[PDB]
Design a protein around this ligand. Structure first.
Ligand SMILES: *[C@@H]1O[C@H](CO)[C@@H](O[C@@H]2O[C@H](CO)[C@@H](O[C@@H]3O[C@H](CO)[C@@H](O)[C@H](O)[C@@H]3O)[C@H](O)[C@H]2NC(C)=O)[C@H](O)[C@H]1NC(C)=O
Ligand SMILES: *[C@@H]1O[C@H](CO)[C@@H](O[C@@H]2O[C@H](CO)[C@@H](O[C@@H]3O[C@H](CO)[C@@H](O)[C@H](O)[C@@H]3O)[C@H](O)[C@H]2NC(C)=O)[C@H](O)[C@H]1NC(C)=O
Ligand SMILES: *[C@@H]1O[C@H](CO)[C@@H](O[C@@H]2O[C@H](CO)[C@@H](O[C@@H]3O[C@H](CO)[C@@H](O)[C@H](O)[C@@H]3O)[C@H](O)[C@H]2NC(C)=O)[C@H](O)[C@H]1NC(C)=O
Ligand SMILES: CN(C)[C@@H]1CCN([S@@](=O)(F)=Nc2ccc(C(=O)N3CCO[C@@H](c4ccccc4)C3)c(Cl)c2)C1
Ligand SMILES: CN(C)[C@@H]1CCN([S@@](=O)(F)=Nc2ccc(C(=O)N3CCO[C@@H](c4ccccc4)C3)c(Cl)c2)C1
Ligand SMILES: CN(C)[C@@H]1CCN([S@@](=O)(F)=Nc2ccc(C(=O)N3CCO[C@@H](c4ccccc4)C3)c(Cl)c2)C1
Ligand SMILES: *[C@@H]1O[C@H](CO)[C@@H](O[C@@H]2O[C@H](CO)[C@@H](O)[C@H](O)[C@H]2NC(C)=O)[C@H](O)[C@H]1NC(C)=O
Ligand SMILES: *[C@@H]1O[C@H](CO)[C@@H](O[C@@H]2O[C@H](CO)[C@@H](O)[C@H](O)[C@H]2NC(C)=O)[C@H](O)[C@H]1NC(C)=O
Ligand SMILES: *[C@@H]1O[C@H](CO)[C@@H](O[C@@H]2O[C@H](CO)[C@@H](O)[C@H](O)[C@H]2NC(C)=O)[C@H](O)[C@H]1NC(C)=O
Lengths: 171, 322, 322, 171, 322, 171
């Protein structure tokens, strides 16, 4: 992808995370589990829902449209009516197929951006109290319980609280 | 202790296409292309269509005897012509501005078939039982239900002259015909006048017709021809018929009401006890999708027709459950 | 000591829409949709339009007596017809190929009204003061300013024959009429000939007309009819008029100049001392914007008409001044 | 946004910075102030101006376009003329509305990218001589005067000059 | 020891345009706009075109004597008319529904010119050597190769009556003419009947013609006029000609075959021993590109015409070799 | 660019790298040379080839399209036929020019993303065993031979192998 997270440095997805598009998996002495990031998932849901509604909205309701009849001495008019009907159909098929293709590419990049931004949010909070071990995972240089994990999932990780213990283990 | 950032995966097998890559499996997707119909003719916005059965538009308007007569007053939302409309014009000839008449009918939502010139009161000095084998009914020779073949009575065809004033408050569609015999012997036999003429006038219509006699190739075993004409009589206006021969006079006319969203379609589908907002010649569409690939001909509020086979928008993520 | 990276914010309340989000407040934006007009009829590229006043195109070309006569020579950039054009054809009948004539006028930028058949020199053996109450002027019966109603003189209507050679170097539009009396008594009274005919020929026009006599519903208190015809006489060509009755002869004709960018519009707006590059029936547009939602009918160099209510492109940033 | 800077890790904008879209705020013993980054702002201005001109350029001048008239026996031609006029209007309204919506999204992401790239330029120059304190701000581990600040705003920050002093304060 | 990440550069000078920036030099690019043609008329899908030479469509169909006669049977893929088609209709008049006839020919892929009414066997009581100076050939007066000018024989013009049954299995295009003399003296001299008429009937065609006599401006030194008519005779149908004067009778007719992808173009390019899938009036296109800016008129499978001067898509990177 | 690599922190391209769009230049005691990254280049080639094919595919084959003729009394029909032909030409010229412009911008950003992602892949592998010296180059804190270089070009760099030696040189 454009942002390198989905199918990138995070190789695969999580079937165990059923409640959201993006989230966290934690492991400490109290256990492990998946937790969807509700804020980013809901924001993405609102944006994607708006994108689909915009696509439907931009297409007007097709009111009644039937064919016309022409006698043997109106071939030119019949061919012009056919040329008009064929030409409009060419454009709308072209417009519809391209719009889906282009918006599909943007949607995948949009999800890729959200994963990367979520990863960067955690990295900036942890700083040198944890180490990047690849695959989008961090190994803490200190004990991090469920309360500490929740402070990472939301925006309130306390870096100065664990700096001393992390420094000793980082050595 | 560790914490990991990740994204959703599931067992979905939906695939979408992008500019850079085809056949991308995704966790969630939305179909935008409607391809399903019920295969039936339905009421549109609660109004049943007008089915002409074995008749085409020309056969129904002229009153071809081989079609089941309709009720005096009908209202509809669209008009259905069956593909093998074998019953149309039965006496050979030309239907002048027939295609224009169909276009007028496409914006009509109701008719009232009424007697404009009563059969036994309008032509006292003329013969009115003319029938032809080309318009047979139950094996017997017959004629159009809405027209009258006037011929000589007691060896005389007096100059006829009749008028009608439109007091219906709606446009009245008047149809008539001009007969062209294949030889002068028949022209004298039927109408007793060789320099015959027909005159039809209203406030905005003014035309004169003259028979053109010649032997012609047989069409439906008729060397003669019958030319058909029509005009829309505005509310309050008068139409005057004047002829000394060859007039195929109107008997029944139609008071027309104007509507919106109607049209004429060709279909072999059958009417059913159903209601729809979108009707196609193949069937009805019940959908809120922006596009459909079922048929370019639509009645009502319909998705836009496109040639595409698939229009699927991705909403979720690339699906990598490995 | 610190250094911070940041972005601009201001007090702007402009909002734009995106694919993912509506109602986004931004620091800077550009409107692309023109919605403002001055509500006046203006000169276009320095050329005033042709206003027909109470006349429509048919009334002006035929010379309806109830419209103020125009100057002999006019040049214009577009033609304005007032919505309630009560003055058009005043004697009932059909204007043959009238819509085609309007399309021809839409590419005309100038006319010269000149005498093609002088009134007191072209018809010495015919009567030329025929007037009708259907074309009244100041309460008195009158007739078209550009046409002459020829009738019998001293109980005789000799076969007339007149021609004109186009030496103007431009197309000459010639208009004439054919009168159809409601009965044979009037036909003999006016033209003394019952088998009357009119012949009009040029190098590329060849038509013959014959009166068709019948009583008709009264239109503007006239049971008669007057059919109007026209042709464009090419530079150097001759037109020949031949008739023994029923000819409503041309008196004035128009030498036409061809231009570009002109057309015919309907408007109740008033002419003003203004100049514009873009004129609509509602008013003039002074704009360099690519789109407008004022009117689909435009004259000149104009923004493209769209149905949208708002087309605002963001140039600046999302505005977060908190 | 797609790049996570605007309304992201940099929560809000600066009303005090009036002379550019992106820039710096500094604070040392000599005082404080805003300074727009002229290079990125001018480059963005050139690109955005070109985008608007392209949108206007692609739309041709609409020359004279009026209606036509048809008699009572030309309903089919009148409906075909109406079908042509309606169809073209449908497409151009569709084309215009979609183009603005799509370019609006790209413009916001373009500004988001410029803020992020400007932030990364400073981060790479400072390295470990300063620390990320969130909200797109850096706290120097050494004294940085106006001359030192200007070397950061342009591309000429001298990392080896302050490495020794920064190391002592970083401790 | 060091390792560096970088990207490709080369000596390319290709430039592309983007939304944000023009004139971007790139390492690799693809042209999508076809601007090259060979400047020749070629066979299309292995089938040579039909070149009319100095004749236009009207001249070829009527059989103008000044054009080289074609072989009895021809098949083609498109029809070429030379811009200065000086040879068309040679006797002045109107070609009724001529534009409709051209549209019919545009879907025709073959003709067989055959004798429908043999010259020395179909008109035994009529004169058949009428020629005119307006249709000269080698300085001598002549006439259309496909038509016969019938006139009186031995001071008599008997009522002629001839028919043809279509046994070709394909549509037969029948052309004929009606002559209108400039005065009654010539009408009696040529056809001996003043109340003359012509009747042409088939199963779906029924028209009657009457001469309209008047003196007219000279066109190609002819005050007379010749009106030309046509109809498509369906397989199995009969056409009957009936006249007592003024008939310009058919001699040769065309059996027509229907095809696809054909049309009529105007070009001064020359035929060459070449084959193409796409033909324009300027030359042939050998290209798989989606767009072309050569000509809006195309025959075959062609790139879509656009007004653009350049359509180059970047595939590689921005080129920075410094 | 949107991602800041091409004409960004990597100022210029390499004429010496002829076999790919993106790659590496290395320098150690055994010598130096260019090496294209075959995986990213081939993936980009597949995506770009698909983009061009999609553009060609969406445009239908233009079958036979010629003009029509009209007599002196069919000006309205002739103008309507001209209006149809002009209108379709306006839209297709508009559609073609915009599609190339929009896809051109996306293509350049696509290449910019690939360079940045390739750079981030190497940075995450090396961690603190090397230092960012600007212009997209890394200076190793340890001896890195051709075998060590190849472990960086592919995904198998052994960080623990050189951590001790790198720490001493990093000091
Ligand atoms: C588009 O993507 C789908 C899904 O990725 C492709 O369908 C998949 O095709 C592969 C091989 O082409 C199938 O894998 C094979 O499975 C069988 C039985 O499990 C195994 O014996 C083989 O060794 C191989 O692993 C896979 O089952 C199949 N998945 C489906 C059908 O859901 C598809 O081919 C792609 N292309 C197109 C044009 O659709
Ligand atoms: C689009 O965005 C604009 C601006 O963000 C919205 O207008 C704003 O609407 C909010 C509430 O809907 C207003 O805030 C309210 O202000 C009053 C008085 O200051 C205060 O008493 C309330 O507690 C609340 O804070 C805000 O003033 C208003 N700003 C304007 C009008 O400039 C708008 O509603 C959004 N939606 C649409 C559909 O436009
Ligand atoms: C689009 O881009 C091309 C290439 O970047 C531009 O062409 C280049 O224009 C510059 C100056 O405008 C030329 O540089 C000059 O070269 C001469 C001789 O080497 C030197 O004496 C000058 O001091 C200056 O360096 C450059 O040669 C030329 N490159 C070409 C033609 O390949 C072009 O101007 C840009 N704009 C447009 C509208 O095309
Ligand atoms: C007329 N039709 C076409 C209508 C018109 C309006 N809609 S609509 O725009 F709401 N469609 C959709 C359809 C599907 C989605 C979607 O991806 N998820 C729904 C929300 O939970 C998401 C989720 C995330 C993680 C785990 C489980 C589930 C999955 C979205 Cl975001 C919008 C379509
Ligand atoms: C026919 N119309 C529609 C014309 C056709 C040509 N233009 S044009 O493309 F130049 N429009 C604009 C209009 C506005 C802008 C814009 O955002 N700023 C102008 C430059 O300073 C920016 C700024 C930044 C930071 C602080 C203060 C100010 C604000 C731009 Cl970049 C282009 C429109
Ligand atoms: C009908 N036409 C228009 C056809 C229809 C199908 N093609 S096609 O899509 F294959 N076109 C191209 C044309 C050129 C390219 C391209 O950039 N390189 C080719 C592959 O090696 C690249 C390279 C990279 C680094 C160093 C050297 C070389 C350069 C691509 Cl990726 C696709 C066009
Ligand atoms: C973010 O998560 C942390 C969890 O560490 C929350 O902090 C705790 O909130 C509970 C509320 O029941 C308090 O009892 C604890 O004392 C808090 N921990 C500390 C260290 O003070 C915090 O409230 C969350 N913030 C949100 C949800 O906005
Ligand atoms: C970037 O900014 C620095 C400011 O630190 C500039 O360096 C100083 O430039 C002034 C010019 O008046 C000299 O007097 C100083 O001696 C320079 N400082 C040092 C440490 O040498 C530098 O010129 C700027 N670069 C630009 C504008 O390209
Ligand atoms: C990645 O590159 C490294 C080069 O360091 C490869 O590792 C060596 O592969 C060769 C195969 O000939 C072995 O003989 C060496 O023993 C390997 N080195 C070590 C340290 O074990 C590795 O195979 C490459 N991986 C790929 C190409 O997937």
């Amino acid at each position: 992808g454009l942002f390198g997270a989905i199918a990138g440095f995070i190789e695969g997805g999580w079937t165990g995370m059923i409640d959201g598009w993006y989230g966290y998996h934690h492991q400490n002495e109290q256990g492990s589990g998946y937790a969807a990031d509700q804020k980013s998932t809901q924001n993405a849901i609102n944006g994607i829902t708006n994108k689909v509604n915009t696509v439907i909205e931009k297409m007007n309701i097709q009111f009644t449209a039937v064919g016309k009849e022409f006698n043997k001495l109106e071939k030119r008019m019949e061919n012009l009516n056919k040329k008009v009907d064929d030409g409009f159909l060419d454009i709308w098929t072209y417009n519809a197929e391209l719009l889906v293709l282009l918006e599909n590419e943007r949607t995948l990049d949009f999800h890729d951006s959200n994963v990367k931004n979520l990863y960067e949010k955690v990295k900036s909070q942890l700083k040198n109290n944890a180490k990047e071990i690849g695959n989008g995972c961090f190994e803490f240089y200190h004990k991090c319980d469920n309360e500490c994990m929740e402070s990472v999932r939301n925006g309130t990780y306390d870096y100065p609280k664990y700096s001393e213990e992390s420094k000793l283990n980082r050595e | 202790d560790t914490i990991c950032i990740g994204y959703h995966a599931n067992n979905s097998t939906d695939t979408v296409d992008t500019v850079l890559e085809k056949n991308v499996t995704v966790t969630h997707s939305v179909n935008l292309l409607e391809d399903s119909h019920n295969g039936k003719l339905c009421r549109l916005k609660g109004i049943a269509p007008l089915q002409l059965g074995k008749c085409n538009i020309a056969g129904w308007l002229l009153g071809n005897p081989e079609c089941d007569p309709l009720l005096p007053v009908r209202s509809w939302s669209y008009i259905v012509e069956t593909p093998n409309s074998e019953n149309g014009i039965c006496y050979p000839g030309d239907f002048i501005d027939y295609e224009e008449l169909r276009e007028q009918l496409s914006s009509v939502s109701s008719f009232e078939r009424f007697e404009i010139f009563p059969k036994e009161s309008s032509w006292p000095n003329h013969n009115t039982n003319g029938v032809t084998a080309a318009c047979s009914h139950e094996g017997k020779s017959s004629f159009y239900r809405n027209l009258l073949w006037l011929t000589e009575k007691e060896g005389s065809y007096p100059k006829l002259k009749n008028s009608y004033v439109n007091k219906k408050g709606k446009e009245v569609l008047v149809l008539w015909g001009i007969h062209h015999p294949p030889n002068s012997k028949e022209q004298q036999n039927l109408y007793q006048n060789e320099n015959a003429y027909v005159s039809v006038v209203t406030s905005n219509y003014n035309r004169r017709f003259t028979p053109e006699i010649a032997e012609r190739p047989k069409v439906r075993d008729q060397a003669g021809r019958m030319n058909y004409y029509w005009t829309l009589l505005k509310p309050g206006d008068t139409i005057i018929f004047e002829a000394n021969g060859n007039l195929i006079a109107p008997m029944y006319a139609f008071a027309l009401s104007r509507g919106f969203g109607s049209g004429i379609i060709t279909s072999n589908a059958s009417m059913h006890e159903c209601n729809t907002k979108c009707q196609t010649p193949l069937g009805a569409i019940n959908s809120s999708l922006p596009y459909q690939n079922i048929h370019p001909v639509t009645i009502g509020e319909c998705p836009k027709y496109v040639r595409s086979a698939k229009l699927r928008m991705v909403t979720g993520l690339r699906n990598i459950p490995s």
